[PDB]
Write a protein that binds this ligand. Structure first.
Ligand SMILES: CN1CCC(n2c(=O)c(C#N)cc3cnc(NC4CCN(S(C)(=O)=O)CC4)nc32)CC1
Length: 295
């Protein structure tokens, strides 16, 4: 008891399947933080979270402290004022300028290269989990654990975006998926920044799969060896032919289209790694612009 009395909740800024997130102020120190409340900790989670506390990087939202009290587990995070969804909405008539898209993509590939080099997966990359500040930085937020825990929040409202960034190996039942799942998600987000429309906006697992298939072609053993033995693969899947990326993310230039196509390879072993993507010619002229944020 009493270990949270040091935090004044200022406003609720998120509700997940398994947690709620507040903007909060430390009453002793005055720091403004994000507090995630999880209602009850498998020791396995105790150590997954402990390793995240050591996973410190300029493009990862810092986990400041973990506090266990009552029937609750509190995670204290660095606070940022806006996420990429809100910024993309505010930017929609114009679109985010390409140099800023490129900066954000580059930074997130750096953050991913870092956490992948430590065998840590995000697992749930999406615009609302990408937080931005006034200095042009963008940071990865709310890493997903390999197994959830806690009490589902009963007031949780379904979000349309939940499946839109899921890699095809996850949708097909892969149990031991790899860092490639994050590269897929980030490529979907890259496409969305460029076009101002979600790339694959499915509302069910099969709708998501079929939206991917209708654009990239139904995968087979030619392009994805082993796909036909995946747990949820069905020979009865419709066979759609691939479309050209030129139709998928116009008016993106060939350097960007090239990189995107490698981020969206079906085969997780052919999909580009974060480290390799950082060397892609798309980033030869990368800079760090500062966005105009209305806070
Ligand atoms: C949508 N959901 C809300 C919880 C969010 N979140 C975490 O999960 C988290 C962890 N761990 C740490 C966070 C730190 N800071 C902020 N700041 C918010 C960002 C968005 N904005 S906003 C709509 O653009 O105005 C308000 C300020 N959010 C965090 C992200 C996902």
């Amino acid at each position: 008891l009493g270990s949270m009395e040091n935090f004044q909740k200022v406003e609720k800024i998120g509700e997940g399947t398994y947690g709620v997130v507040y903007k909060a102020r430390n009453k002793l120190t005055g720091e403004v933080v994000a507090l995630k409340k999880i209602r009850l900790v498998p020791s396995t989670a105790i150590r997954e979270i402990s390793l995240l506390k050591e996973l410190n990087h300029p493009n990862i939202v810092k986990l400041l402290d973990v506090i266990h009290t009552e029937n609750k587990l509190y995670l204290v995070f660095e606070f940022l004022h806006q996420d990429l969804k809100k910024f993309m909405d505010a930017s929609a008539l114009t679109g985010i300028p390409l140099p800023l898209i490129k900066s954000y993509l580059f930074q997130l590939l750096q953050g991913l290269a870092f956490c992948h080099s430590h065998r840590v997966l995000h697992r749930d990359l999406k615009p609302q989990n990408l937080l931005i500040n006034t200095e042009g930085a963008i940071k990865l937020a709310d890493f997903g654990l390999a197994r959830a825990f806690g009490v589902p929040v009963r007031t949780y409202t379904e979000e349309v975006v939940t499946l839109w960034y899921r890699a095809p190996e996850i949708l097909l039942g892969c149990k031991y998926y790899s860092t490639a799942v994050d590269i897929w998600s980030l490529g979907c987000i890259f496409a969305e920044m460029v076009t101002r429309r979600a790339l694959f906006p499915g509302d069910s697992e099969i709708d998501q799969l079929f939206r991917i298939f209708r654009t990239l072609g139904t995968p087979d053993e030619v392009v994805w060896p082993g796909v036909t033995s995946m747990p949820d693969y069905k020979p009865s899947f419709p066979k759609w032919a691939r479309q050209d990326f030129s139709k998928v993310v116009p008016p993106l230039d060939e350097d960007g289209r090239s990189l995107l196509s490698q981020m969206l390879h079906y085969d997780p072993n052919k999909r580009i790694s974060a480290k390799a993507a950082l060397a892609h010619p798309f980033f030869q002229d990368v800079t760090k612009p500062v966005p105009h944020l209305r806070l």
